[PDB]
Amino acid sequence: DVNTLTRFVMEEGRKARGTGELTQLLNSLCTAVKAISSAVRKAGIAHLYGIAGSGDQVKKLDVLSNDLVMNMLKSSFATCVLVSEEDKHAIIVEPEKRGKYVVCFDPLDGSSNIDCLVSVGTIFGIYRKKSTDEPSEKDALQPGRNLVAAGYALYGSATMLVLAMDCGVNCFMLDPAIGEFILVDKDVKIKKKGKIYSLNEGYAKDFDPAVTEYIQRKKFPPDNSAPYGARYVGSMVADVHRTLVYGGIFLYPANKKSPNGKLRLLYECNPMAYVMEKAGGMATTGKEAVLDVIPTDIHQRAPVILGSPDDVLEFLKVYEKHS
Amino acid sequence: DVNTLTRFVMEEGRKARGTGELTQLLNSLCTAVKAISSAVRKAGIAHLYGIAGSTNVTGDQVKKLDVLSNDLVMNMLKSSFATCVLVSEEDKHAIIVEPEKRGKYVVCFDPLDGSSNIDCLVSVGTIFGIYRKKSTDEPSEKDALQPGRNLVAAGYALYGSATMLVLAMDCGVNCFMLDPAIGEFILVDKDVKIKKKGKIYSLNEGYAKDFDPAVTEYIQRKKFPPDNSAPYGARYVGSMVADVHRTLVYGGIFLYPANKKSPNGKLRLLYECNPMAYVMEKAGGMATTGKEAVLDVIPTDIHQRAPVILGSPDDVLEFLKVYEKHS
Amino acid sequence: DVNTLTRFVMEEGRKARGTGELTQLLNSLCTAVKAISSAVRKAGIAHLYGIAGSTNVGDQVKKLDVLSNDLVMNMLKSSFATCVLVSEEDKHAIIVEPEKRGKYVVCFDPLDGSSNIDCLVSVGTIFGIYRKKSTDEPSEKDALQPGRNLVAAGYALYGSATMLVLAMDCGVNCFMLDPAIGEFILVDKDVKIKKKGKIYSLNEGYAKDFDPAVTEYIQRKKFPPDNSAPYGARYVGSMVADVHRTLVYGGIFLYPANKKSPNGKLRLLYECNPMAYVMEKAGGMATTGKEAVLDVIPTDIHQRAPVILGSPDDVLEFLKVYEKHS
Amino acid sequence: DVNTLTRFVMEEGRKARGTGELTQLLNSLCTAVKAISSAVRKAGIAHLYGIAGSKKLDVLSNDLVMNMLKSSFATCVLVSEEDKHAIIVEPEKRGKYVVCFDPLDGSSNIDCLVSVGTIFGIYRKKSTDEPSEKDALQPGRNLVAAGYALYGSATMLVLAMDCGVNCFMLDPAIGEFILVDKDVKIKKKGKIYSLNEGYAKDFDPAVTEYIQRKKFPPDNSAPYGARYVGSMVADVHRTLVYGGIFLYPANKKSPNGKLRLLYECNPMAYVMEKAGGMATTGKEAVLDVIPTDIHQRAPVILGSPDDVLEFLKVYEKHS
Ligand SMILES: Nc1ncnc2c1ncn2[C@@H]1O[C@H](COP(=O)(O)O)[C@@H](O)[C@H]1O
Ligand SMILES: Nc1ncnc2c1ncn2[C@@H]1O[C@H](COP(=O)(O)O)[C@@H](O)[C@H]1O
Ligand SMILES: Nc1ncnc2c1ncn2[C@@H]1O[C@H](COP(=O)(O)O)[C@@H](O)[C@H]1O
Ligand SMILES: Nc1ncnc2c1ncn2[C@@H]1O[C@H](COP(=O)(O)O)[C@@H](O)[C@H]1O
Ligand SMILES: [Mg+2]
Ligand SMILES: [Mg+2]
Ligand SMILES: [Mg+2]
Ligand SMILES: [Mg+2]
């Protein structure tokens, strides 16, 4: 039987005996992702270029993507606190639309590299609100371990949605002919060991010696096995998704312009660590699992090394040698 | 004033006082690219997965998409009545157009790079180079053995976050964005020029153990600049269209170099290196094998390989300085 | 606040305190309608005409009425919500396999008007949903319920745009399909038909065989006795298109009986009853002449029924002329 | 071999040894029609209804055709049902063609999702004079090309030129018009008649008699069926594909018909005549009427030749 995101989510909610609040949240998010995909693919650009007679386009797509997610989540009546990469402060849902869930997300990562048209994505993580206080940014300060659901959408050669929950990781492809997400990979598990590593080696001068030794082992394997291949798109969704599909390791460690790391814990590192862990992979800061970090600030950064367990374990052995 | 690919090509055809054959070729290619884009974005995949009770999902779906793209380009170019010899990355021998449909042009192309690209969910592309047949001989694979200097038009389609067509001719390089609401390529960047010097390098650093020593030294200088300027950033998608387009838009350098195990590189001259070298030179960039300009190599086999280092001129010239140091 | 069909259906399910089964049925139906709409607008026709050569053509080669039936049948079976399915395209009712069985009975016309799709006339999909009542193993007999028993009914119109009209206990709601994102957007809530309209709709070419009551009533519309302005005429020849015009603009639609066709032409289970249910939930009427369409107890799943529907004042006036020819 | 509108039009231009100007005009019109089709199918309607938190179709449709034709560099005078006066193209964008069009026929009933369409007629300017409104006052016989796009269950463009009538289906997967029916010819005689029978009280007696002949046939044949969508593009397109007859005759609110000669009657009459059909006002061929007003109305009776001749026979009796 063919399965769709809507049917899958509804059936998991029935199995969970949920009220349908998280189901409506996930439905609303899926609708936003379909609308972001349409805009990313430049539907209607002819009108902006004067087909009917009439600034920073990359920023403006980021703003529109933020507005789509915010409006769809607000109107789900399922959320109370929304944290977005695009917004300095957490957004507090108005009382009349308040639900029980906290959503942290990056609606799009264009600002940087959408001019070259290769890959942008949406990343989200969903928490149950934990405290009984009036809603505030503190409700988003939960460790990744508390996530009830997380995932991402890749707007690449096709549009794919990856959704991780307690049941595991499932991959859906957007069929643009009918605007439906079709289930194409069920209960996805990452390979135990890969053959690709992914990181910005332009930071080589600023890497700590554990990263430098680990990367040297991939290029010059001390057992003269074949060296790993390298890939680095520079868009987290693209690099993490390749890691999930083929196995291997993705690294964004701390460097000098970023000694707490570069990627953001709440809506980049934690969702991807959750997907990885649910797929049987790993995600570490070097010192602890990403999901165990207790955040103190909604936009705080984190180092992240994630992917196949044998590869991350091998990095951690090198990291322990240097500690 | 709004501009579409169709109108742009038609107007360039009128300015050159062409008969319309090349205009028909380019129209046919544009239609093929729109059809590849629709297939790459997975239109109709629900039917493959049984929404109407019929399930396929049979073989290597990535290979099947490459083959479909090849069939789209082949068929559209054959039915243009503008071509006589078609060389495709997907085909062992050159395809000879049937006598009733032969026109004046030779087209070399890679219709899609899905099977050679682990980042194919991130992006795939189509690359093409168009030549005029030079002799009246009965058409054969020899007609595609021209140096890239002889190109009349070349370019690529990037199937990325959006679909873009980059078309280079004597008038320069122009970039068109596909509006999927109406199926028109809209002119969005006119007479594009690459920046003189970039800040990004692009190559597979997993080959590092077997790098040619000039590549090792050059990349070492990108990471550890001897003058203590800021290091270059690295990017490598593994799809030539994506990596070359980034180089065009942002500047920098792209390398698929030779080494002792692959003394002629890995990428293919006719339908990868030459089209991208032509776009680069028309944009004010450079494209070298290390020993000569890519566009000056006279090919002897339709699938022959070439090393290629291309991008912003100051960066390519710096690489050649290091190359000469090791020569 | 923007509302999608998915959010609307889910919210109405939470309100009614349902288990989710009907919600999944409507979700599955909405997905089939989007697929039908994509095919009706001829997505992929270029492959049929050889864009990639002769060999690059499975579902692509099926006629639209065949494909549409497969889409609705498959999506409904896979909803796990149905047990008996009746379609214009199959002589016998389909009994869903036990492992996919749910509580509901769906009667549908997957692509009405496709007889004339060659001229690009609007076509549609019509559906009525019942809950199974009987104790027994599911059989064709569970579809033999009167329209009064419907829990939901409606239609999709593939016109200049694609719209889904969904009628339930809570009224009639209209959703426009946004093709950029594959979402049905709520555009008209709790729709009510006008009390009286100014358009009549029937095939006048068959006037020679008209029932005498239909003859007189149509003459009143063309030559009003009170010297009021005559009604306009409209007949698309596609029931979903004519009924939707009637709903949106008011007026009257007729597919009546004559003595060549004593029970009319349109099918009761999956043409007349869904449209009668939409009309009543909108404040309109639908009659066979002798009784309400929704009160007819069917004895055959493909049985025909005469239908006269539209604004209440218009249908009342027809009933008067019809009662006069008692 | 598959063919597209773009490739078809370009090849016909190569055959006629055109300079490319009329080809650019038809390319530009094709683009406008795809954009109108997108808007008619309601792409983007979710944004209007607040999906991201906060023009009418015939105005947008007019803007699309107007701007695409102006930027074609192929036109000098533009008449639209939407504009009271003819639009004169500025000198820098001026070509030799005059285009009369209805950007979105049937649109005022678009709330019921009725099929709508775009109708166009293209003439060549004769004079050396500066362009003006008078240059669109030409008889339908002077047309170099005409046709329509129907935004029905699918979108199709019907293009008529000297070479005949050709039908193209818009494939929304790729945004290409695909040639699906070549050198189309209408049936010699049909079985459907199309007119608003609500005006029966005002019908000219020839119309009344002709319609009676369709319902009560004089010759041992079955009655014609009736269809009247109420959008001319839909009714005429059905008339083309199934054969038959379409009538909008003189009634009392419209004593010289309701349909507009320059951008409704003329293009449909040209399509009909190129397809082997006919189109008459009753007194003469539609294409032979010399217009004196760019928005003048005409009665029209068109369709299969045997049915039009049959109407003309009844009409001449009463005349
Ligand atoms: N659609 C769904 N998919 C997966 N899990 C769900 C779903 N709906 C509810 N749940 C689970 O049930 C809990 C309560 O759901 P709710 O009543 O919707 O807030 C959630 O926090 C999840 O753990
Ligand atoms: N659409 C066009 N754009 C640019 N150059 C063209 C075009 N059409 C023709 N030309 C030039 O004119 C030559 C002859 O054109 P053709 O007669 O169409 O083969 C070509 O090889 C080009 O040098
Ligand atoms: N999504 C919905 N919209 C409207 N009514 C519903 C919905 N879901 C359930 N109901 C009502 O609740 C009943 C229980 O259906 P079920 O969904 O099978 O539990 C249905 O037969 C309807 O009367
Ligand atoms: N694309 C075309 N299709 C059919 N006929 C054309 C075409 N282009 C030009 N012609 C004919 O040649 C004439 C001159 O065209 P042009 O030089 O483009 O104005 C036109 O008015 C038509 O009679
Ligand atoms: Mg962002
Ligand atoms: Mg290839
Ligand atoms: Mg039917
Ligand atoms: Mg009009």
Q: What residue ranges do the domains of chain D occupy? A: 1-183, 184-318
Interface of C with A (CB under 8 A): 1-4, 6-7, 10-11, 13-14, 19-20, 23-24, 27-28, 31, 34-35, 37-38, 43-44, 74, 78-79, 179-183
Would you state the structure tokens that stand for residue B313, as one six-digit string?
């001129």
Distance of alpha carbon B136 from alpha carbon B143, whole angstroms: 10
Residue C171 — φ and ψ, nearest 5°? 110, -165
Which residues in D lie closer than 8 A to residue C203 (C-beta atoms)? 225-227
Q: Which residues of D touch B (CB under 8 A)?
A: 1-4, 6-7, 10-11, 13-14, 19-20, 23-24, 27-28, 31, 34-35, 37-38, 43-44, 67, 71-72, 172-176
**Which of B2, B182, B184 would you mutate first to test chain D, the one with the most D CBs within 10 A?**
B182
CA distance B258 to B278: 20
Is residue C24 in contact with ligand 3, taking CB distance under 6 Å?
no
From B110, B243, B281, B315, active-site residue = B110
Joined together, the tokens standing for residue B119 give 């980042």
Q: Kindly report the nearest CA distance between residue D284 and chain A, in angstroms.
A: 39
Q: Quick one: three-class SS letters along chain A?
A: CCCEHHHHHHHHHHHCCCCCHHHHHHHHHHHHHHHHHHHHCCCCHHHHCCCCCCCCHHHHHHHHHHHHHHHHHHCCCCEEEEEECCCCCCEECCHHHCCCEEEEEECCCCCCCCCCCCCEEEEEEEEECCCCCCCCHHHHCCCHHHEEEEEEEEECCCEEEEEEECCEEEEEEEECCCCEEEEEECCCCCCCCCCEEECCHHHHHHCCHHHHHHHHHHHCCCCCCCCCEECECCCHHHHHHHHHHHCCEEEECCCCCCECECCEHHHHHHHHHHHHHHCCCEEECCCCEHHHCCCCCCCCECCEEEECHHHHHHHHHHHHHCC
What's the one-letter identity of residue C227?
A: N
Q: From the CA of B71, how many Å to the nearest CA of chain C?
A: 5
Which of D126, D102, D136, D122 minimizes the C-alpha distance to D26? D122
Which residue out of C41, C42, C48, C56 would a mutagenesis test of the B interface target, given it has the greatest number of B Cβ atoms within 10 Å?
A: C56
B14 in contact with ligand 2, CB cutoff 6 A: no
The closest of C258, C318, C259, C313 to C287, measured between CA atoms, is C318
Q: Helix, strand or coil for residue B118?
A: coil
Query: 10 Å Cβ neighbour count for C223?
Result: 11
Catalytic annotation on C109? yes
Yes or no, beta carbons of C70 and B52 under 8 Å apart: yes
B110 appears as a binding residue in the annotation? yes
Mutate to test the pocket of ligand 4, among D22, D26, D125, D141 (most ligand atoms within 8 A of CB): D22
Residue type, A73: L
**Experimental approach:** X-ray
Q: Indicate if ligand 2 lies below 6 Å from the C-beta of B11.
A: no
* Closest residue by Cα to residue B273 from B249, B293, B253: B293
Contact criterion met (CB < 8 Å) for A53 and D31: no
Q: Which of C116, C178, C208 has the CB atom closest to D216's CB atom?
A: C208
- Could you give the CA distance from residue D163 to residue D52 in angstroms, rounded to a whole number? 49
The answer to whether A272 and A261 have CB atoms below 8 angstroms apart is: no
Interface of D with A (CB under 8 A): 31-32, 35, 43-44, 46, 50-53, 55, 60, 63-64, 66-68, 173
**C-alpha A163 – ligand 4 centre gap (Å):** 56
A121: CB partners within 8 A, 6+ apart: A106, A108, A109, A152, A153, A154, A155, A235, A236, A237, A238, A241
Q: Quickly count: other Cβ atoms within 10 Å of residue C261's Cβ.
A: 15
CA distance B41 to chain A (A): 4
State yes or no: is A108 an active-site residue. yes
Q: Using CB atoms within 10 A of its CB, is residue D111 exposed (0-12), middle (13-18) or buried (19+)?
A: exposed
CA of B152 to the centre of ligand 2 (A): 8
Residue type, D132: S
Residue A126's φ and ψ, nearest 5 degrees, are -125, 125
Atom of ligand 3 nearest to the CA of C18: 19
* Backbone torsion region of residue C237, taken as left when φ is above 0, otherwise alpha when ψ lies between -120 and 50, otherwise beta: left
Q: Is C216 annotated as a binding residue?
A: no
* Residue closest to D4 by CA, chosen among D32, D37, D26: D26
User: Ligand 8 centre and the CA of C228: distance in Å?
Assistant: 27
D234 token code pair? 């839909």
Q: What are C56's two structure tokens?
A: 């690059």
Residues 6 or more apart in contact with residue B33 via CB below 8 angstroms: B126, B157, B163, B165, B178
To the nearest whole Å, the CA of B68 is away from the closest chain C CA by: 7
Q: Is B198 annotated as a binding residue?
A: no
How far away, in angstroms, is B307 Cα from ligand 1 center? Answer: 55
Chain A residues in contact with C43 (beta carbon < 8 A): 177
Task: Considering only the beta carbons, identify the residue of D35, D44, D46 that sits closest to A51.
Answer: D35
Token pair in block for residue A180: 């439906």
The neighbours of chain D, by the rule of 3 or more Cβ pairs under 8 Å, are A, B, C
Q: Comparing C-alpha atoms, which of A25, A33, A13 is closest to residue A161?
A: A33
Q: What DSSP designation does B138 have?
A: P
- One-letter amino acid identity for B3? N
Question: Which site among B47, B74, B75, B179 would you substitute to test the C interface, given the most C Cβ atoms closer than 10 Å to its Cβ?
Answer: B47
**Residues 6 or more apart in contact with residue B97 via CB below 8 angstroms:** B78, B83, B84, B85, B86, B103, B139
User: Helices D21-40 and B5-15 sit at what angle, rounded to 10 degrees?
Assistant: 180
Q: How far apart, in Å, do the first and last CA atoms of chain D sit? A: 51
List chain C residues with CB under 8 Å of A23: 10
Q: List residues bridging with B224 in a β-sheet.
A: none
- The CA distance from B52 to the nearest CA of chain C, in Å, is 4
* Sign of the alpha-carbon torsion through A95, A96, A100, A101: negative
Specify whether the CB–CB gap between D118 and D154 falls below 8 A: no
Question: What are the tokens at A96?
Answer: 């009349």
Question: Which residue has the CA at smallest separation from atom 1 of ligand 3?
Answer: C13
C12 lines ligand 3 (CB under 6 A): yes
- Do residues D289 and D298 make contact, with C-beta atoms less than 8 angstroms apart? yes
How many angstroms separate the most distant Cα atoms in chain C? 66
Q: Looking up tokens 């048209």, which residue turns up? A: A117
Contacting chains of A (3 CB pairs or more, <8 Å) are B, C, D
Test C208 with D230 for CB contact under 8 angstroms: no
Residues near ligand 1 with C-beta < 6 Å? A 9, 12-13, 16, 18-23, 26, 100, 128, 148, 165
Q: Is the dihedral of CA A236, A238, A241, A247 positive or negative?
A: negative
Q: Please state, in angstroms and as integers, the Cα–Cα distance from residue C219 to each residue in A208, C200, C307, D251, following that order.
A: 93, 11, 19, 18
